[PDB]
Write an enzyme that holds these catalytic residues in place. Structure first.
Site, PDB file in Angstrom:
ATOM      1  N   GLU A 174     170.074   2.041  58.542  1.00 20.54           N
ATOM      2  CA  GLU A 174     171.389   2.647  58.714  1.00 20.54           C
ATOM      3  C   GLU A 174     172.515   1.780  58.174  1.00 20.54           C
ATOM      4  OE1 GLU A 174     170.670   3.403  62.848  1.00 20.54           O
ATOM      5  OE2 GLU A 174     170.435   5.575  62.514  1.00 20.54           O
ATOM      6  N   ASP A 181     166.647  15.185  61.701  1.00 20.56           N
ATOM      7  CA  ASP A 181     165.543  15.961  62.250  1.00 20.56           C
ATOM      8  C   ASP A 181     166.084  16.922  63.306  1.00 20.56           C
ATOM      9  OD1 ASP A 181     165.041  14.670  65.134  1.00 20.56           O
ATOM     10  OD2 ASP A 181     165.445  13.037  63.744  1.00 20.56           O
TER      11      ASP A 181
HETATM   12  C1  LIG Z   1     160.361   3.606  66.070  1.00 22.19           C
HETATM   13  C2  LIG Z   1     161.373   4.276  65.713  1.00 22.19           C
HETATM   14  C3  LIG Z   1     162.575   5.019  65.363  1.00 22.19           C
HETATM   15  S1  LIG Z   1     163.337   5.632  66.866  1.00 22.19           S
HETATM   16  C4  LIG Z   1     164.629   6.651  66.291  1.00 22.19           C
HETATM   17  C5  LIG Z   1     165.831   5.831  65.886  1.00 22.19           C
HETATM   18  C6  LIG Z   1     166.753   6.759  65.118  1.00 22.19           C
HETATM   19  N1  LIG Z   1     167.894   7.015  66.024  1.00 22.19           N
HETATM   20  C7  LIG Z   1     168.436   8.375  65.956  1.00 22.19           C
HETATM   21  C8  LIG Z   1     167.552   9.573  66.158  1.00 22.19           C
HETATM   22  C9  LIG Z   1     167.226  10.479  65.156  1.00 22.19           C
HETATM   23  N2  LIG Z   1     166.459  11.489  65.658  1.00 22.19           N
HETATM   24  C10 LIG Z   1     166.262  11.338  66.965  1.00 22.19           C
HETATM   25  C11 LIG Z   1     165.560  12.059  68.039  1.00 22.19           C
HETATM   26  N3  LIG Z   1     164.902  13.198  67.767  1.00 22.19           N
HETATM   27  N4  LIG Z   1     165.594  11.521  69.270  1.00 22.19           N
HETATM   28  C12 LIG Z   1     166.260  10.367  69.555  1.00 22.19           C
HETATM   29  N5  LIG Z   1     166.924   9.649  68.638  1.00 22.19           N
HETATM   30  C13 LIG Z   1     166.958  10.127  67.376  1.00 22.19           C
HETATM   31  C14 LIG Z   1     167.535   6.576  67.380  1.00 22.19           C
HETATM   32  C15 LIG Z   1     166.715   5.352  67.038  1.00 22.19           C
HETATM   33  O1  LIG Z   1     167.575   4.283  66.601  1.00 22.19           O
END
Ligand SMILES: C#CCSC[C@H]1CN(Cc2c[nH]c3c(N)ncnc23)C[C@@H]1O
Ligand SMILES: C#CCSC[C@H]1CN(Cc2c[nH]c3c(N)ncnc23)C[C@@H]1O
Ligand SMILES: [N+]
Lengths: 232, 232
Positions: free
Chosen positions: B15, B200
């Site tokens: 990021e 996502d």
């Molecule tokens: C291991 C590993 C990676 S954990 C996901 C990252 C991305 N961010 C944002 C995020 C993007 N999509 C998400 C989701 N579906 N749930 C929670 N958080 C997020 C929350 C965490 O920093």
């Protein structure tokens, strides 16, 4: 060869009330970042006492403030906890050997529960301080247990969640701040000891037990914390 | 009348990669508390960029360090998030008007979910900064949405949890750091703006979507953050 600076933390005001009373010294109240820090002098040591407010974010913030703004060289945590195991009864004292954030879940990426990249499931506390705690407890004939403490941002009050904590993490007690306090200390290289006295059994009656025993259990932990500071 | 000091935060290295690239200035790397802070000068402003590492404790720590150790006067967060609502699609940009810690549960004491004593369910961000974001987006013909962001220490990848976040908090997006960053800023009186680009849909395919779109979505957010800093 400066004066030793010791951070003393609880989560709730009720956990630090007995701390302030037992040290019995005059404290200067210093507001910073939504906390009040109580700064006093006790036996060639500067003690900085605060309650963080409840939970992981609060406790992370306050521990970071203690280290960066007050320059503490050690952090001792005192407060209450829920018991996860039959042999830990109301009022019993536990020193945390490792702690976990039990509510962390990155299992979507096949990480074990509790794990975050660039960290670890279990956070260690200070071996030297834990050894001191055990030495003092043995000398005073105090039953001091040791084990894993699970911390999360939920008050645990169900058989199902208790059993998860035991099965997943082999935890002995549950609370909402120890792992975050110990984590911050690890990141800054600051020795940390986490003490907890049992207030409840983390089951369906835990809320009522907690309200009943908070004062007594907080005092039990505080008295032990003071006995540690007496040997630093 | 000193130089304005601006903290710029992401959660993951990915990021902040586009942030460092887009500013295009030389940065001094300064290690502290397990983070690396990148300190540079950009148009009469000192910018301090870091990634916290994932989740609430990490982000709380790093934000507190930015404020206490680097003296930042504003904090801008840039990163990616899961969409909770049909109109927020992959790559869309959202500014958080309020944030909540969606995993906080003190319901054993009849507190609403998200609430902690001596705090609030919803944490506000800076109205002046959010107004600036909206002004810039309108001028550049960028669709910028606004809404509530839910933050917790779980990667959300289920219909059931998505629906809870919408029903309980009226959240539009989900992530693991915004609420803690905004919370720390509120406690220190530091203006905060939280930007997220959708990676996502927080459903059963979220892990795969996240891995596919992290780079692009991170860049989208970073570019917008830079456009804000250009107007500070
Ligand atoms: C291991 C590993 C990676 S954990 C996901 C990252 C991305 N961010 C944002 C995020 C993007 N999509 C998400 C989701 N579906 N749930 C929670 N958080 C997020 C929350 C965490 O920093
Ligand atoms: C509103 C309100 C009070 S929330 C509970 C306090 C007490 N503490 C320790 C604790 C004692 N018993 C617990 C339990 N069963 N679950 C989690 N944590 C604990 C964690 C929080 O600081
Ligand atoms: N959490």
């Amino acid at each position: 060869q400066g004066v030793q600076k010791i951070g003393i933390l609880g989560a709730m005001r009720e956990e630090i009330t007995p701390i302030l009373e037992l040290f019995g010294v005059d404290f200067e109240e210093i507001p910073l970042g939504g906390n009040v820090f109580h700064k006093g002098v006790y036996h060639n040591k500067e003690i900085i006492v605060a309650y963080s407010k409840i939970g992981k974010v609060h406790s992370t913030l306050t521990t970071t403030s203690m280290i960066l703004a007050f320059g503490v060289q050690k952090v001792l945590f005192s407060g209450v906890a829920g018991s996860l195991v039959k042999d830990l009864k109301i009022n019993d004292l536990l020193v945390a050997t490792q702690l976990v954030q039990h509510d962390v879940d990155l299992s979507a990426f096949d990480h074990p529960l509790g794990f975050i990249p660039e960290s670890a499931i279990f956070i260690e506390t200070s071996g030297s301080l834990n050894a001191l705690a055990k030495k003092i407890a043995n000398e005073q004939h105090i039953a001091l247990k040791e084990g894993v403490i699970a911390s999360g941002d939920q008050f645990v009050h169900s058989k199902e969640r208790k059993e998860f904590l035991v099965s997943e993490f082999k935890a002995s007690a549950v609370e909402m701040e120890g792992a975050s306090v110990a984590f911050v200390c690890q990141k800054f290289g600051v020795p940390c000891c986490v003490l907890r006295s049992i207030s409840d059994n983390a089951d369906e009656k835990a809320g009522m037990s907690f309200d009943e025993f908070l004062e007594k259990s907080a005092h039990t932990s505080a008295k032990f914390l003071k006995s540690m500071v007496d040997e630093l």
